[PDB]
Write a protein that binds this DNA or RNA. Structure first.
Lengths: 101, 137, 100, 140, 75, 50, 151, 184
RNA sequence: CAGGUCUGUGAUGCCCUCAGACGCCCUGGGCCGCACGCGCGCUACACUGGCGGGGCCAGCCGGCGCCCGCCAGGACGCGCGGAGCCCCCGCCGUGGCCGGGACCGCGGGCUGGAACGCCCCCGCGCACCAGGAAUGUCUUGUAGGCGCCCGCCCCCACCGCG
């Protein structure tokens, strides 16, 4: 279950529909401030189906598709899954490595 | 004058009972379960605190006279330190809504009149405050 | 005509500003120029580490720019005070400004 | 003359001796809707010293605890405010706190996320300094 | 190592506890809490009852410390 | 083209007048002079000691 | 609060024969004395009711040593600004002593009255010179310094 | 003059003719808050109300530094608790406590290569140590107890004035004096 | 002094580099990681204290109102304005307790292009019950306690300078 809606309902859930349910940061990013053309163009590539955008937050339709994310050196592979929707992929891709002392 | 002749605390407590008896203010009872000031941590235990705060706020607006002090200024009069953090504690203003509610009741009651910028005590309210003070004396 | 013209003298040096005060008071004394209204001094301050690097016990240079400002009140004909500005001794690096 | 021994309410023996507004503060170390006073103040009076809680009033205190908006408690409070899965806000108290916390911690492991990966290694999450204060007990 | 009597003491030993403090020529809330092992929170509420009685008069009354001496009880 | 990759704004680029150095601008009275740069030019501004 | 020209701003005229100034630790009190019934007012409030309840005797101390009858027949309006509570209690006793003495002026009785106060408490009629010292670089305190890590 | 508006200085005379000069009740003022500079001059300290010196000794340990108003409040409540039990003038019981708490012999090296020798404590030092010891015994006693500072201060003064060894100050005096007798 | 600064400088010898740039920009990431050792600090270890109301006091120097919001903060305007400690009354009351506030789970804000920054609400409740060998600063408005401002600054001080 995610924020009330079941997964099938939440993938059909529109980005401005799933926003009242999301957390404060998401409402600022998709509502008041909004996003630029480059963030939208990456989302357009997901729509095309069938990146360096750490800032970009997960959208419901993108679930089930894995997006490569730069950590500053290599494109870390990050899968998209149901409980992580609306959460910036920058917390999903890690720049650092384990302490290994 | 009068409100000075009676100690400030012996006036505020008696005025709190008076402002609950005459039905002045009327506690919102939605702010009853709220804690005044981000600075504090455990909320007032008085339960009649709204009346003590209400009688204290009219007594401030009386001594202000034509100064016409604002609600934010009154919140800075109820500011305390935010203690309980590793970072050194600093002064933090009181909740604006509580005081805004108190000043709103006085404007409707006509005990306090509206003025340029902040509101100030009305003559009709002053009469109640000074008669109570002399009565305590 | 008859308006009030506000002269403001802004000067870094006290002796220089006191000299401008003497000339302004003297020229307008007949025109009822007011006695100098001395502004609270503006002691603008910058404290910087004496060293370019961070080496040594940290030392501090305490630099204070004090600005002394005198406000002057004259009520009279405008043309006379425009000439009064020429009459008063000109101090280089010291400024006068007239506001109606 | 009227004083009673500690009652086990919510899986903990809450001492009858300590004031009721704070005897409930150590509710098994998990819960506290009142924030020192609100839950009891809404139904009864505080400063009772405890051990005089009438069982019917004790049931009434339990009822508000279990159902928050039934008594009209402020939605700004509550242990859980959005329910990551459920989508609802309610107070979570006692053992439920542990179970929900484990599920949230499991969720960060399930979807690999730095907060969970740091949590697995015991590395500090939120706190950002480990160079000096990370000695901890000679281990993070 | 605490004073377990906390709320309204016990039952009939409360009268003997009242007798003990009345026996003292002068009392302080902290002094009853240690001597009677009843806690100082209980002592304040017990003291107000025997001040209403008129058994003891508060020589000095402060929010910090409140101290009382017996007005009479000489004979 | 080249313009879109040239000086795109990310933040203010502020420098000490006289030094062209981003560090320690010291704009306390809008005097954007470097901390080190200011000590060389303090007499000229007229800043004085006790 | 800082030595502002606000003497007549609180009260217009009222035949205030004297306008004394008593200053302790950055706190100044302008006291206005006229013929009265023995009333003394501080900051538009009875002198007996002062904020440091413990130090409320210090304010009334010049009246006790000089005598109530000499004080009777005077009304004093005192406005204290700057400084803090204990200094404001020290400033008003100094202001009251100076102002009551001003009524005697150059009289032999004033010389005795100044000596009478100076004996019970000296500096009651004399300003205390102590003033705060500045913080110096390398120390949080004016004279205290940072702990030396090595040596 | 009635200290705390309750106690005169008329009967408060120190019996110890060696310590009477350094204990003064003449300068007493209701409320021991005289802001007179005692730091100035080598012996101006001697000409100070004894009760004010106690009020300056009470505020120590840093967490309580500078709060004279709170210390003198304690002195008043302690004096009431001394009046309540002793049934005597509490300014006079303090005077006897200061006189007894002061040791007359100390140990100092005296130009020796660690070998201390016997010295004689000055009549000002006897007064300064005596008051300091009274306040420090109370300070240690009230650190983790339900007993208030006022109660323990009241009891050290009551115990010192007779000379009971329960007083932390009198035990200190007997230790200091005995080490001085052996190092003699 | 061969102390430190060529990385403040259209200060600069010489070497390197010098269009696949060591020029200058553009995106992303680090400097802030961390088995650990050490240097400033900060907050505690409680009752001379914590917690609730009430009084209310500055100075370097300094804007506010009204309405909404639990605060945080916001909207809409305008011309202005002010601390803690302490004092006073309650409460808890020697219990790692309501001392203490580290951590950690939702959530509400903010600033910016973008958090990983900051703020805040209900949880959550770490050591620490006074610190060994050592060592440092300080003589009156000083020590210490207690606030406050400014510098840098989108936000941000446990820092420096006042």
């Amino acid at each position: 279950n995610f924020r009330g809606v079941e997964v099938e309902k939440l993938a059909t859930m529109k980005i401005t529909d799933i926003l009242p349910k999301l957390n404060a940061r998401c409402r600022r990013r998709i509502g008041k401030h909004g996003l630029s053309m480059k963030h939208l163009r990456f989302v357009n590539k997901l729509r095309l189906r069938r990146t360096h955008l750490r800032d970009m937050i997960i959208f419901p339709e993108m679930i089930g598709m894995t997006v490569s994310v730069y950590n500053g050196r290599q494109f870390i592979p990050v899968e998209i899954k149901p409980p992580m929707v609306g959460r910036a992929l920058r917390e999903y891709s890690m720049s650092y490595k384990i302490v290994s002392h | 004058s009068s409100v000075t002749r009676v100690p400030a605390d012996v006036f505020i407590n008696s005025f709190a009972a008076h402002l609950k008896n005459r039905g002045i203010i009327k506690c919102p009872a939605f702010t009853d379960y709220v804690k005044t000031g981000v600075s504090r941590q455990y909320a007032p235990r008085d339960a009649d605190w709204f009346y003590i705060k209400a009688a204290s706020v009219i007594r401030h607006f009386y001594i202000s006279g034509s100064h016409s002090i604002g609600v934010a200024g009154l919140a800075r009069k109820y500011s305390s330190l935010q203690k309980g953090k590793t970072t050194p504690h600093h002064t933090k203003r009181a909740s604006c809504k509580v005081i805004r509610s108190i000043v709103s009741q006085f404007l409707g009651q006509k005990l306090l009149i509206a003025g340029e910028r902040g509101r100030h005590i009305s003559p009709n309210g002053r009469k109640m405050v000074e008669d109570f003070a002399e009565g305590l004396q | 005509m008859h308006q009030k013209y506000t002269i403001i003298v802004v000067g870094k040096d006290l002796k220089l500003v006191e000299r401008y005060v003497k000339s302004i008071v003297k020229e307008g004394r007949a025109f009822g120029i007011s006695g100098p209204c001395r502004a609270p001094v503006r002691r603008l301050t910058i404290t910087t580490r004496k060293s370019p690097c961070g080496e040594g016990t940290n030392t501090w240079h305490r630099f204070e720019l004090r600005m002394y400002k005198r406000t002057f009140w004259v009520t009279c004909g405008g043309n006379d005070i425009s000439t009064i500005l020429s009459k008063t001794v000109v101090i280089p690096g010291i400024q006068v400004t007239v506001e109606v | 003359n009227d004083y009673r021994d500690l009652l086990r309410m919510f899986n903990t023996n809450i001492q009858g001796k300590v004031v009721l507004e704070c005897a409930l503060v150590g509710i098994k170390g998990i819960g506290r809707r009142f924030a020192n006073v609100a839950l009891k103040k809404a139904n009864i009076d505080v400063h009772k010293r405890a051990g005089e809680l009438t069982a019917a009033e004790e049931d009434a205190l339990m009822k508000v605890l279990e159902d928050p908006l039934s008594h009209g408690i402020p939605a700004w409070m509550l242990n859980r405010n959005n329910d990551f899965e459920s989508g609802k806000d309610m107070h979570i108290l006692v053992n439920t706190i542990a179970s929900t916390h484990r599920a949230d911690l499991e969720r960060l492991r399930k979807t690999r996320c730095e907060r969970g990966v740091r949590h697995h290694h015991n590395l500090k999450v939120r706190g950002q300094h480990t160079k000096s204060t990370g000695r901890r007990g000679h281990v993070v | 190592k605490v004073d377990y009597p906390t709320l309204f003491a016990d039952e009939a030993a409360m009268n003997e506890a009242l007798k003990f403090i009345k026996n003292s020529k002068c009392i302080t809330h902290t002094q009853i809490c240690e001597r009677l092992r009843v806690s100082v929170a209980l002592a304040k509420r017990v003291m107000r009852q025997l001040v209403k009685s008129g058994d003891f008069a508060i020589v000095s009354k402060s929010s910090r410390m409140t101290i009382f001496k017996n007005m009479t009880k000489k004979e | 083209m080249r313009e879109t990759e040239f000086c795109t704004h990310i933040a203010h680029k502020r420098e000490c007048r006289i030094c062209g150095n981003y560090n320690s601008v010291y704009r306390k009275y809008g005097l954007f002079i470097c901390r080190r740069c200011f000590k060389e030019n303090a007499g000229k501004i007229g800043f004085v000691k006790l | 609060d800082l030595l502002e020209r606000n003497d007549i701003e609180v009260r217009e005229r009222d035949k205030y024969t004297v306008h004394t100034l008593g200053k302790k630790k950055n706190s100044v009190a302008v006291a206005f004395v006229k013929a009265g019934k023995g009333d003394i007012l501080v900051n538009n409030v009875p002198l007996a009711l002062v904020r440091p309840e413990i130090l409320r005797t210090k304010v009334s101390e010049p009246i006790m040593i000089l005598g109530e009858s000499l004080f009777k027949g005077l009304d004093m309006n005192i406005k204290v600004a700057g400084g803090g509570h204990v200094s404001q209690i020290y400033a008003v006793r100094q202001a009251i002593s100076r102002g009551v003495l001003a009524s005697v002026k150059d009289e032999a009785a004033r010389s005795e009255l100044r000596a009478k106060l100076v004996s019970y408490d000296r500096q009651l009629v004399v300003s205390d010179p102590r003033r705060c010292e500045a913080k110096k670089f390398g120390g949080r305190g004016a004279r205290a310094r940072r702990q030396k890590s090595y040596r | 003059v009635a200290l705390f508006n309750k106690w005169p200085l008329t009967d408060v005379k120190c019996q110890d003719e060696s310590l009477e000069a350094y204990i003064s009740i003449d300068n007493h003022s209701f409320v021991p808050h005289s802001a007179g500079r005692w730091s100035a001059k080598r012996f101006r300290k001697a000409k100070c109300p004894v009760v004010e010196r106690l009020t300056n000794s009470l505020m120590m340990h840093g967490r309580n530094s500078g709060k004279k108003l709170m210390a003198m409040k304690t002195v008043g409540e302690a004096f009431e608790l001394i009046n309540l039990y002793t049934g005597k003038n509490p300014v006079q019981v303090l005077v006897d406590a200061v006189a007894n708490s002061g040791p007359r012999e100390d140990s100092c090296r005296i130009g020796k290569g660690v070998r201390r020798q016997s010295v004689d404590v000055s009549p000002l030092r006897r007064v300064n140590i005596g008051i300091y010891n009274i306040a420090t015994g109370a300070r240690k006693a009230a650190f983790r107890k339900v007993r208030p500072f006022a109660e323990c201060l009241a009891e050290e003064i009551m115990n010192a004035a007779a000379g009971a060894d329960k007083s932390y100050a009198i035990s200190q005096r007997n230790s200091v004096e005995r080490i001085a007798v052996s190092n003699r």
